[PDB]
Design a protein around this motif. Sequence first.
Motif, short mmCIF file in Angstrom:
data_model
loop_
_atom_site.label_atom_id
_atom_site.label_comp_id
_atom_site.label_asym_id
_atom_site.label_seq_id
_atom_site.Cartn_x
_atom_site.Cartn_y
_atom_site.Cartn_z
N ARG A 1 -10.82 -4.43 -0.46
CA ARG A 1 -12.14 -4.55 -0.71
C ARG A 1 -12.44 -5.99 -0.94
NH1 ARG A 1 -15.34 -0.17 0.32
NH2 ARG A 1 -13.97 1.57 0.43
N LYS B 1 -6.64 0.14 -4.44
CA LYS B 1 -7.59 -1.17 -4.01
C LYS B 1 -7.21 -2.28 -4.29
CE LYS B 1 -11.55 -1.24 -6.44
NZ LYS B 1 -12.94 -1.35 -6.85
N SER C 1 0.94 -1.17 0.06
CA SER C 1 0.08 0.08 0.06
C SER C 1 1.01 1.27 -0.01
CB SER C 1 -1.04 0.00 1.13
OG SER C 1 -2.03 -1.22 0.99
N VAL D 1 -6.71 -2.93 7.23
CA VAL D 1 -7.69 -2.10 6.79
C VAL D 1 -8.07 -0.79 7.93
CG1 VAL D 1 -10.27 -1.84 5.80
CG2 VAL D 1 -8.67 -3.83 5.32
N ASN E 1 -6.70 -0.22 1.80
CA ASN E 1 -8.01 -0.38 0.94
C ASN E 1 -8.30 -1.83 0.52
OD1 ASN E 1 -10.42 -0.03 -0.01
ND2 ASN E 1 -9.82 1.34 -1.63
N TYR F 1 -1.59 3.25 -2.01
CA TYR F 1 -3.01 2.75 -1.67
C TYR F 1 -3.96 2.53 -2.61
CZ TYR F 1 -1.03 3.83 2.96
OH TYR F 1 -0.06 3.53 4.05
#
Length: 477
Positions: free
Chosen positions: A423, A373, A366, A415, A421, A371
């Motif tokens: 997901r 996704k 990240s 997170v 990030n 950063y």
Amino acid sequence: SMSLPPDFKWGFATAAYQIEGSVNEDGRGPSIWDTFCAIPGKIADGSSGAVACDSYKRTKEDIALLKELGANSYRFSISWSRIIPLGGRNDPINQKGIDHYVKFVDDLIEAGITPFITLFHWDLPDALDKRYGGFLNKEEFAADFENYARIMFKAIPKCKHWITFNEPWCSAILGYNTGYFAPGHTSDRSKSPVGDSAREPWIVGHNILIAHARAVKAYREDFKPTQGGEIGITLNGDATLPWDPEDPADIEACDRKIEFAISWFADPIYFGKYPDSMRKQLGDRLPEFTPEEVALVKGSNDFYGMNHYTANYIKHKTGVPPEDDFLGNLETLFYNKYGDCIGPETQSFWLRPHAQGFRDLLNWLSKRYGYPKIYVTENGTSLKGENDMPLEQVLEDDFRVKYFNDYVRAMAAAVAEDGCNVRGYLAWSLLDNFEWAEGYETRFGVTYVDYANDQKRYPKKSAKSLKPLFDSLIRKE
């Protein structure tokens, strides 16, 4: 501090060659892995992907299982050689194969499951390997890959999550340095009539980046505007700790190891160049992007697809490293200077649990790449001696329950506490399956598959544990 956003995608991952079976049904051509399993001594247990979990004829069942375990997402791969049995852009297309996967994605969607589709998960149609050496021919492979990609994008517009390649590190180093994985190339002539371990892997690495990038441009230009969705590559890579925490050079090498294993691919994709540490060690054996190529590859991830399993203590080496080196002039170890361990053994010699490392590497990736996704497209474990155990013991897989618990929670801190990030999370694997060079002995499934009784499915305790685990972490709004 641990909490995932409300849209958080989770479920399971598989790969086509590893589960599907029906190796010759419905017009499928051979892949480099069908050829490789035929050569005695290459597969630890003399087996092949023939039959495997018979998943090609059991979509209905595998879907009912996903729904039963509560998964909201499912990652799987398209066997290229079911779509174009010979693989190339001028070869006949196999409409049965297209239709199979289009229907599967509809059944998936009907069941409330989000498909994540991997275009290339190592099953290169053999004919392309025989014709021009596959990844080794840049313009030929890129054209054929791009052709294949576009057929799939046109046929499955309902998919909104695309992965070009699974773990190119494996295709390149294991395929062309050690020869452990298909097509088996290496300099060692007791193992392969062809290969140059010092030069081929870097060429393969290079050309896959190119083919990946073409496929993405094609997606973004002719498919995204009308169909939406996203596309990226899936990179694997394990975490690093210094073998001597007092030694600045081990600490440096913790970064360098990661650069060789991951940034090899990720730096070109975010920055349009290879890592400086790789340039330095490898020189002219590391290809160079043309300006046209730099602009193609750079910016070519909609998301960061991540596979992760373990960590290693890293101990710098002095001197000039051998021509054959791919690690970056260093050793990996499971024990440090003061006898500390990464964790207990699994069935895989290379795999030891270390959840903290998952978090460390999420952070590392990240920070370096702004950063992005992240979808975690593979995480999971084998369990030592699992293939030898009595059914009732297998299903009580407390070791695997614990791996997922610690790794998912370490991710959730990544997170909520560190701002990475992430997901989505996809557990490797839904089924016990064909684990490549190690065959069926190594089991990664949350579901036991009884190969001797018509591939019968038994959810292990790990499989049921994920829903409540994720219920405890995913925010409602």
